[PDB]
Ligand binder design. Structure first.
Ligand SMILES: COC(=O)c1ccc(O)cc1
Ligand SMILES: Nc1nnc2ccccn12
Ligand SMILES: [Cl-]
Ligand SMILES: [Cl-]
Length: 163
């Protein structure tokens, strides 16, 4: 575990993380995909061997010794707000189990279902709160990756509010 487990946020490409493992915002079919998923495919293509997994689950595939945790959030275009919220929470619980199993001291994580799976809505708070619910009981240093300047400020404020 980390000596003083923490949350941090960084505004940069998650493919350039400084953590011991990465969470991919995957699609269920293990395809190269869009956004975070395509950056992860370019950096760790070997990790897409048999990476397909259902919505609400996470599947880890090693690239060398570096773990890629493929976490499948729901596409809110297809799911109801109610069912989507349940699957989004479940995906993060499966990420916490994998991070714990791997014994890493740090993990790089994106906000699941906030990009092309958002159904055209702002889901920063919804996704971040499900991340906290899952990860608060783990002792890994968690570094949350985003790309938007106002998202960085809102994520930073949410972390500091609890400290
Ligand atoms: C924090 O998000 C990313 O790491 C990211 C990488 C590549 C993209 O095209 C989009 C987002
Ligand atoms: N998760 C995330 N980081 N930056 C952005 C920007 C728009 C929508 C989602 N985002
Ligand atoms: Cl960058
Ligand atoms: Cl997304």
């Amino acid at each position: 575990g980390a000596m003083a487990p923490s949350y941090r946020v960084k505004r940069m490409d998650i493919a350039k993380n400084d953590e011991e493992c990465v969470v991919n915002a995957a699609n269920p079919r293990g395809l190269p995909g869009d956004g975070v998923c395509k950056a992860v495919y370019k950096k760790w293509p070997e990790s897409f061997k048999n990476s397909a997994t259902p919505v609400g689950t996470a599947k880890t595939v090693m690239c060398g010794t570096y773990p890629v945790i493929h976490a499948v959030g729901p596409n809110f275009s297809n799911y109801t707000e109610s069912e989507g919220d349940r699957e989004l929470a479940a995906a993060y619980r499966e990420v916490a189990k994998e991070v714990t199993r791997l014994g890493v001291n740090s993990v790089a994580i994106p906000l699941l279902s906030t990009g092309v799976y958002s159904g055209g809505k702002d889901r920063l708070t919804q996704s971040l709160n499900h991340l906290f619910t899952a990860m608060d009981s783990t002792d890994a240093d968690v570094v949350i990756y985003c790309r938007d300047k106002e998202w960085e400020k809102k994520i930073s404020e949410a972390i500091q509010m609890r400290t």
